[PDB]
Write a protein that binds this ligand. Structure first.
Ligand code: THM
Ligand code: THM
Ligand code: G1P
Length: 289
């Protein structure tokens, strides 16, 4: 399965932070934002990943992450000329996707919680339909909103409803079969002038093939869309990491844990970073039993 990170957008709300740095290059505690959605695709077992960003920012992401060989993965890059909707990911990424199933993750979403890798690996191994992830939120009218019955069957999905039918946001992580490319080609802009992911998901719902996994209250799903929310996400990750000996979204650790890279390869990544605590962490892991 392949994956796409949609890592463009204007980041207008974060001005002036996003005058000359991509929102997705801003820190979440100690790591560039994009590390977090990338780590989610890696943990799902996805090794062939396309990163989409603006004309100006795409080369900045390639500078940061390269082609992926350090991580035992393949990273490729494409440009989105204007932020005209999430569903454009599949249009820009058509040649990349080919005949394969594909997951999409949004650049500014931060997922963390127990039990998450099992849900990911389940979604990644589901060969048919669309899987979305719902999460109970305070202000559901800000988000795509999924309404489901007693058996978890989707009833409705609506983008930023004025009268939300549930408190469940449709978070920025989506797994699709190959039908998504033709679906994305056949939707039209909304009132926001965007080719909405919600409309991709409605196409699967028409077919009875939109499947929702619930991310329960013990899970954290944050986004970094405002100054206040970006600082709050940074604090959250800081708290988790301070207490534990383990890091969140340490890409090189994940590459090792997923078996994408060897112990020797991890040592070689740690060496030029021994001047800092991040390299020290990687070295310590490589030498653990
Ligand atoms: C609407 C839109 C969002 N984005 C990204 C920026 C944020 O990470 C997220 C916004 O939901 O998606 C794009 O890259 N292109 C777009 O067209
Ligand atoms: C195993 C591993 C999990 N995680 C995250 C995924 C889940 O949100 C949480 C529990 O697995 O920790 C990492 O960020 N790095 C790792 O190396
Ligand atoms: O934040 P945006 O771009 O308004 O909203 C976008 O991401 C949200 C998740 O972060 C989803 O709930 C929305 O369906 C999607 O259109």
């Amino acid at each position: 399965m392949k994956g796409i990170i949609l890592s463009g957008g204007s980041g207008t709300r974060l001005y002036p932070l996003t005058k000359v740095v991509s929102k997705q290059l801003l820190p979440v505690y100690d790591k560039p934002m994009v590390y977090y959605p990338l780590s989610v695709l890696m943990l799902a077992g996805i090794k062939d990943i396309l990163i989409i960003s603006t004309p100006e920012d795409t080369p900045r992401f390639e500078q940061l992450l390269g082609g992926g060989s350090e991580l035992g993965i393949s990273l490729s890059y494409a440009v989105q000329s204007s932020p005209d909707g999430l569903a454009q990911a599949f249009i820009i990424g058509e040649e990349f996707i080919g005949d394969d199933n594909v997951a999409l993750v949004l650049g500014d979403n931060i997922f963390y919680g127990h039990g998450f890798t099992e849900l990911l690996q389940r979604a990644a191994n589901r060969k048919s339909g669309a899987t979305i992830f719902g999460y109970n939120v305070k202000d559901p009218q800000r988000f795509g909103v999924v309404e489901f019955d007693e058996k978890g069957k989707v009833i409705s999905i609506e983008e930023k409803p004025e009268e939300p039918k549930s408190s469940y946001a449709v978070t920025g992580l989506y797994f699709y079969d190959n039908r998504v490319v033709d679906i994305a080609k056949n939707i039209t802009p909304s009132a926001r002038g965007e080719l909405e992911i919600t409309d991709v998901n409605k196409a699967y719902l028409e077919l009875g093939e939109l499947h929702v996994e619930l991310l329960g209250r013990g899970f954290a799903w944050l986004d970094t869309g405002t100054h206040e929310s970006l600082l709050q996400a940074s604090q959250f990750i800081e708290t988790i990491e301070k207490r534990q000996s383990l890091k969140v979204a340490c890409l090189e650790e994940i590459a090792y844990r997923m078996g994408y890279i060897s112990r020797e390869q991890l040592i070689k990544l740690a060496e030029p970073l021994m001047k800092n605590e991040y390299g020290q962490y990687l070295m310590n892991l490589a030498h653990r039993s």
